[model samples]
Structure formats: C-alpha cells, structure tokens
Target: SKSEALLDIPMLEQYLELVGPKLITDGLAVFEKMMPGYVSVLESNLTAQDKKGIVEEGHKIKGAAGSVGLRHLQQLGQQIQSPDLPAWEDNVGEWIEEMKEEWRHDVEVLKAWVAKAT
Candidate 1:
C-alpha cells in the first residue's frame, strides 16, 4: 500500500487551512466521494476493451492525485499510463491487485488522520 496519509482528510483540511477553506472543502468532497469510484473505473478499464481508454483513465487519476498531493497514487497511475511499458492491459489482474492494496492503505491513513483531528 502506498499510504497516502499526506492527502487524508485531517491533513487535507490542515492544508486547506493554509490555502483557503472553501476551495479545500470542495476539492476534498470531490476527492472523497468520487476518487474511489474513478479509481475503480481505471482498474477495470484494464480489460481488453480499449487500451487508450484505460490509459486515459490513468492519466486523469494521475492529474487529480497530483492536484490533491497524492504523489504515490499519481506515480503508480503514470506507470500504468506509460507507453514504453510492456502490455499493461495484459496484466490487468495484477494491476487491479496493486490498486486495491494502495486504496486500502490510503483509507487506513485517512482513518488515522481523522482520529487525530478529533
């Protein structure tokens, strides 16, 4: 797991305290409600359907993660998006496994952060 604690709720809210609350809240809501769904779409896109679509999904997540300070997720998504890489789609199962691990780690980090904030 990548353990994206830096991007978890408390840390994110802290970041927003510096940047501006409204902007941070909006971004956090979007990320909290939408990113998991979007990440699922990305992992599932690894099917043989359309490789470009899969890559595009990865690119989108990469950008979103970067914008939100999720460096590890962004980097992993980029690796999947890389053209020079071997047949990523062909290894769809493995990729999904990896994605789940990262997702779980991020959620755990988020939980700890929330606890700390309270």
Candidate 2:
C-alpha cells in the first residue's frame, strides 16, 4: 500500500509545468458524469443475477480511465472485470472506494493547477 501510494508522485515537475490542467478537469468532469450511473448500476447489479452486467460495467470504467491517463483506475477497472473479483455483495464497496480516491485526487490536482493558472 505504501508503494501504491508512492506511485501518485509525479515525474517532469507536473506542478511546475502546468501541463494538462484542462485535460485533468475535463477528465474529472467526465468521471463525475459517469460515476453516479456506475454506482447505481453497482448497487443493483450486486444481486446474483446481475454479475455479468457488473463485470461489464467495470470493463467500461477501465476504458474510461484509460482514455484519461488514470492507469491505476484502468487497472482497477480490469480487476473488477475479473470473474474472481466477487460482486456487489462484497468487494464492490472496496472497488468503489478506490475509485472515489482516484477521482478525488485527480480532481484536487486539477483544481490546484487550474486555480493557480488564472
């Protein structure tokens, strides 16, 4: 977990350069729009009958995160896509919490840069 957290540190002086602040905000906006729908589906899909849909939703999350350079979320999306990852009954909460962390950090970083930019 420590190593995992360490991965959040950036290379190339991201804060100094201010590259991709707009991209980060745009990415967060997209994530925000999609997250509620994903959460709602996770809640309903935790039922035994909805495993297939749940895995599919996770797969979609992977694609979305991959689009925005959030590799960790992309991988998390794939992890949930695995058959062994369990369903909404158990690991879904953990999965969603992880997603929230990623989303929050991403938004915060973007907000900091965007605020400073102007």
Candidate 3:
C-alpha cells in the first residue's frame, strides 16, 4: 500500500532541495532508527491494556508520519488512538503490518533518492 500513503516524490525532492539533502537523510534515519522501538512500545502497551500509552505514542508518530507525508501511517496512528472501539486490537494489528510495509518501501525509495542527490 505504498501508493496509498504515498509521498509526493517531486515535492519531497523540492523540500530537500530547500532544506538541504542532509536534512532528508537525517530525517529518514530518525524514522528508521525509531521504528523498531516504536513498534515495541505499541506491542507492550497493547499487551498491558494501556490505552493511554498507546494514544500518546500514536499521536507522537502520527505527527511525524503526517509531517513526512506518510498518510497511511498517520491514519493508522489516529485509528489506534481510539480506545473504545471493538476489535481494536485486530484492526491495529492489520494496519501496523500495512504501515510497516509502506514504511519499508518508502524508506528504500527515499534512500535511493538521497543516494542520487548526494
């Protein structure tokens, strides 16, 4: 679903051009570095039935995802923040997998772009 939360490649390139290519590299690294830990927190919070932690972390990543134009992850983050929904766990699980796949693909795309830019 990479296209679903698709980033505008040209737009990203334009921003990187203005912000400097290093910023893009650094920003992508931040997402790559934080991803595993973020996923772990989600799993732990879900296991402990800690909705507050989930909501907080979800909001944190939601902002990051939206800022970077990862629309699906942003949407998932919002969905995961809703506490009283039935089958929330299942929905979260599905969306997380989708988001992860999207992230991996997008990261690879960005990495290639950075390689070219540099």
Candidate 4:
C-alpha cells in the first residue's frame, strides 16, 4: 500500500476550524455525488480528441481537487489540461488512466472522512 496521505492534513486542519465540519462534509458530499459526471465528461472528451473539452474539464477538476487539498489528482489534473505541451496528444491517454485510478481511491478516501468527520 502507498504511504502518503492523499489529502493535505495541514490545510485540512485550517479548513475544519475555519469552515466547520458540516460545511466541509457538505462540500465533500457534493463532490461524491457529482464526481462520476466529471469522470464521464473527461473520458468522452479524451475519446473525442476534444482538446478544449479536456482542457476545460482538467482546469475545472484541478481547481476542484486543489480546493480540497487532493494531492495526486491536482498533479494529474495539471497533466491532462496542458494543451501546449508537444507530447500532450500522445501522452494524454496514460494521464487519463492514472487520473481514473487516482480518483477511484481519492473519492473513497474523501467520503470515508466525510462520513466520520461529520
């Protein structure tokens, strides 16, 4: 198993105190509900080779993930969204694959905490 905590606990500490547990859990619940849509749109965009869709979705999810201090997803989101890179087209599938796996674990971890934290 991996060793690193996916969520930034330090940032999370401030969020918990500043925003309160209910707000944190509420926001997390929303993500839990809508996460599948995010994944579906991104996957279809990749298959369609829709660069604008991919870039916009990547930016959307990157900011979303960053808001919750999601570590790997933040990085993976960056990789998928960068349209200017020369290798972007060829490497995108791999990036999406990683994002899928990472999100799979991430959402669960997020939900698990939300369940207990509230």
Top-TM-score candidate index = 4
Q: Which of candidates 2 and 3 is the stronger one according to lDDT?
A: 3
* Per-residue accuracy of model 4 over 1-31 as CA lDDT, tens digit each: 2314677667777887788777776767677
Off by over 4 Å in 3: 1-5, 83-90, 100-102, 114-118
lDDT of 2 by residue, 1-118 (tens): 4223322335213633665456656766887688778756755776555778878988988887666555577777787788774464566658756775566565455455455654
Q: Model 1: how far is 46 from its true place, Å?
A: 1.7
Of models 1 and 3, which has the larger TM-score?
3
Count of clashing residue pairs in every prediction: 0, 0, 0, 0
Model 2 has an lDDT value of: 0.63
Q: Residue 50 CA error for candidate 3 (Å)?
A: 1.6
Q: Which of the two candidates, 1 or 4, achieves a greater TM-score against the reference?
A: 4
Cα lDDT listed for each candidate: 0.63, 0.63, 0.71, 0.78
Q: Per-residue lDDT tens digits of candidate 1, residues 1-118?
A: 3344346444466675677555544554576677778767865666556677777877887787666656566676787677577766466456656765675465456445544644
TM-score of 2: 0.60
Q: If ranked by TM-score, best first, what sequence of candidates would result?
A: 4, 3, 1, 2
lDDT for model 3, on a 0 to 1 scale? 0.71
